[PDB]
């Protein structure tokens, strides 16, 4: 074999270097070549032990595939389990303490470990099945969501009336931009909509913003916060990864429950139809949500764009709803679609003027109660968008959007908003 | 009369300042804009005043070849720095009778409005007026925010 032990030779060298040579931004030109062909032996040859290694690595760590972790779980777990595989605890804490132009990209490391696990037929699927299940901190809070109707959260307000999980995006100060914990909230919340029995539909839409130019008007989402990715503050795997893998494709196939309940021979998951009503405008991450819903909703000002880093999984999904040439004009030249142009359908089921949005919003909600409806979004899914499929994208996605999180050029327009 | 009295020192200047509009000769170009950045250029008895001796400026002036028409920079809180082309006539002095027949509804309609489409009548006071008793020029609108 004989690749683990170059690993942990190439693994040495890094950490040797790094301890030796100065802080990010005080070193010459001869030494930032150094450390960059260090971490490119590096990271080469955490690609070559993982090609015939992913399989028994994601054995040992989940019992044979006989123990679910998510996302955090199996990255921290693989750590320590295979020291300089990807980064520790401790590694990740001081590279969270640097602005994104100074750190090291330890991250990249785990983009190239999450790409083979997910590239595996056997782990892949495993893991993703590991991300559709509950969250803990949903489990915690449901006996009280179903007897209260109402959870309040930092970016986002959940209400059940009428059937209806009302989920609003509630960050009244920065046109609700996307971070970790935003996906946290949303992850908890959407798990809340899908476990809760007197629960038939979901509802996505912004809240009322406070900003002194948006005041009183709602907003659906701006995209991440690029203050807090140029600070360091977007997490690859608890941000990037996590809200692809968890309540985005929760909204697709819903949670995957215990074999707890009489149907689950059938039905493994609890999946529900979801509704979205963009006000104002849905820009990056909140444009990537509305290629997953089964009915979107927008006012008539509204407009839709994907504005340097892959925008999740719109390059998987954009395709699909309105082909090769406008999904190029939309993620590569940076095109902008207004709900009124003829092309917003390719998006947008409704366009309402906003006097009339509101009523419109409602009609939609009562028209996705079936059991008809659930089987139908099922087989529709199912042939939209295969397991294989996402799944191919998302191993690939790891590693590609591992290297742009950390891209010069990236790092450059970030600090510039 | 206005505009009579100010050609001289706009042929001179190629600026005037009013209290709603904002000319400017630019390239050739009579450059109006509307600058009530308090109020969403509200129309009002002197926004007509100010329209209809700028637009005679602007055709009478023989350095000037197209008009153009645009909203200034906005100052209320809701669009401070975007331009705003016009948000109709003010509600609020129509409410408190501040709105002539006459001088506005009236004037704005024969006067500034009809001037874009038919010119000036000058007086015979140059050569082809026998053909052009008028002085029209061609007008260029750019609409912000609504
Ligand atoms: C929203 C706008 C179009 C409106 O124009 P204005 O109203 O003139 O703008 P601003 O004054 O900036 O907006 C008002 C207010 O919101 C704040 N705001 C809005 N969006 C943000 C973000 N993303 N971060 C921080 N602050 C923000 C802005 O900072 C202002 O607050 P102050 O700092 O207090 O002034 C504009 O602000 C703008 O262009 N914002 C940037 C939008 C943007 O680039 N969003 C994200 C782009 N890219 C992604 O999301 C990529 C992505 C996301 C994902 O989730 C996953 C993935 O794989 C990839």
Same mark, same amino acid.
């Given at each position: ?6 690993? /942990?030779?190439?693994?040495?060298? =890094? ?30 040859? $955490? =690609?070559?032990?993982? *090609? #015939? ?13 006989? !123990? ?5 779980? +199996?990255?921290?777990?693989?750590? /320590? ?6 980064? /520790? ?27 083979? !696990? ?16 509950? #969250? &803990? @901190?949903? +489990? ?20 059940? @009336? ?10 009244? *100060? @920065? ?8 996906? *946290? ?11 809760? &029995? ?14 002194? $130019?948006?005041?009183?008007?709602? =907003? ?30 929760? +909204?697709?196939?819903? =949670?995957? /429950? ?14 529900? &139809? ?42 998987? $999904? ?26 917003? $359908?390719? %998006? ?6 906003? *006097?009339? %949005? ?44 591992? %290297? ?14």
């Amino acid at each position: 074999d004989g690749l683990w032990a170059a690993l /942990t030779e190439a693994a040495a060298s =890094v950490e040797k270097l790094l301890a030796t040579l100065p802080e990010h931004g005080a070193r010459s030109s001869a030494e930032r070549a150094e450390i960059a062909a260090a971490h490119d032996a590096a990271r080469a040859l $955490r =690609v070559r032990f993982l *090609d #015939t290694h992913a399989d028994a690595v994601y054995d040992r760590l989940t019992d044979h595939r006989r !123990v679910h972790l998510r996302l955090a779980e +199996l990255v921290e777990a693989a750590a /320590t389990a295979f020291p300089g595989l990807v980064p /520790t605890q401790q590694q990740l804490a001081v590279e969270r303490s640097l602005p994104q132009a100074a750190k090291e990209g330890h991250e990249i490391d785990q983009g190239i470990f999450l790409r083979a !696990v997910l590239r595996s037929p056997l782990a892949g699927p495993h893991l993703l099945d590991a991300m559709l299940r509950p #969250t &803990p @901190r949903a +489990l915690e809070l449901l006996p009280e969501f179903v007897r209260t109707g109402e959870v309040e959260m930092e970016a986002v307000h959940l209400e059940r @009336r009428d059937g209806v999980a009302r989920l609003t995006m509630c960050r009244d *100060d @920065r046109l609700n931009a996307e971070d970790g914990q935003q996906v *946290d909230d949303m992850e908890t919340a959407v798990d809340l909509a899908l476990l809760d &029995p007197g629960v038939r539909v979901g509802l996505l839409r912004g809240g009322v913003m406070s900003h002194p $130019r948006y005041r009183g008007k709602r =907003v659906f989402s701006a995209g991440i916060n690029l203050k807090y990715l140029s600070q360091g503050g977007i997490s690859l795997v608890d941000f990037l990864m996590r809200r692809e893998l968890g309540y985005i494709h929760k +909204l697709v196939r819903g =949670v995957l /429950t215990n074999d707890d309940r009489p149907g689950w021979w059938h039905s493994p998951r609890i999946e529900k &139809p979801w509704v979205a009503a963009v006000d104002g405008f849905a820009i990056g991450g909140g444009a990537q949500l509305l290629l997953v819903f089964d009915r979107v909703l927008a006012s008539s000002d509204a407009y839709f764009s994907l504005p340097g880093i892959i925008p999740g999984a719109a390059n998987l $999904r954009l395709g699909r709803f309105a082909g090769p040439r406008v999904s190029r004009q939309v993620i590569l030249e940076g095109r902008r679609i207004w709900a009124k142009e003829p092309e917003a $359908r390719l %998006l947008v089921d409704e366009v309402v003027e906003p *006097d009339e %949005l509101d009523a419109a919003i409602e009609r939609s909600l009562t028209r996705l109660d079936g059991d008809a409806v659930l089987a139908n979004r099922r087989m529709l899914n199912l042939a939209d968008e295969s397991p294989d499929g996402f799944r191919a994208y998302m191993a690939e996605f790891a590693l590609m959007q591992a %290297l742009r999180l950390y891209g010069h050029d990236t790092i450059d327009k970030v600090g510039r908003f």
